[PDB]
């Protein structure tokens, strides 16, 4: 639950921008919470992570 | 040509390990928590040294 790609399309909103710097509620592909995003240059994500 | 075939097989079971993840995200060390007494100390302090 709350992670994956088998989503329920009952309640619908549109995809928004990842807005960095401000405290926001996020629903990122099932993950939910509150926080502040910061864009970074990462090299540790493989094709499955 | 002095070549050999090789296939090594050992059984699996459910058990607890301590895995070390390095700077890039690669598992570099592991310890089986119930194999010796040093591994008891290592899994207890959650340290490899
Ligand atoms: C604080 O407010 C300033 C200006 O109103 C804004 O630029 C900044 O992103 C805000 N920071 C946070 C953490 O809300
Ligand atoms: C294979 O091993 C034998 C062992 O005596 C050696 O004499 C021979 O030169 C080796 N041949 C090759 C192709 O490695």
Curated annotation (Swiss-Prot), chain A:
Protein name: Spike protein S1
Function: Attaches the virion to the cell membrane by interacting with host receptor, initiating the infection.
Coverage span on the entire protein: 597 to 645 of 1351
Gene for this chain: S
């Amino acid at each position: 639950i709350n992670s994956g790609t088998t989503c329920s399309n009952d309640l619908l909103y549109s995809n928004t921008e990842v807005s960095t710097g401000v405290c926001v509620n996020y629903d990122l592909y099932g993950i939910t919470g509150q926080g502040i995003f910061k864009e970074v240059s990462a090299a540790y994500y493989n094709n499955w992570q | 040509d002095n070549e050999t075939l090789e296939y090594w097989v050992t059984p699996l079971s459910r058990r607890q390990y301590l895995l070390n993840f390095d700077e890039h995200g690669v598992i570099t060390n592991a310890v089986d928590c119930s194999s010796s007494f040093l591994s008891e100390i290592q899994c207890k302090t959650q340290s490899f040294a």
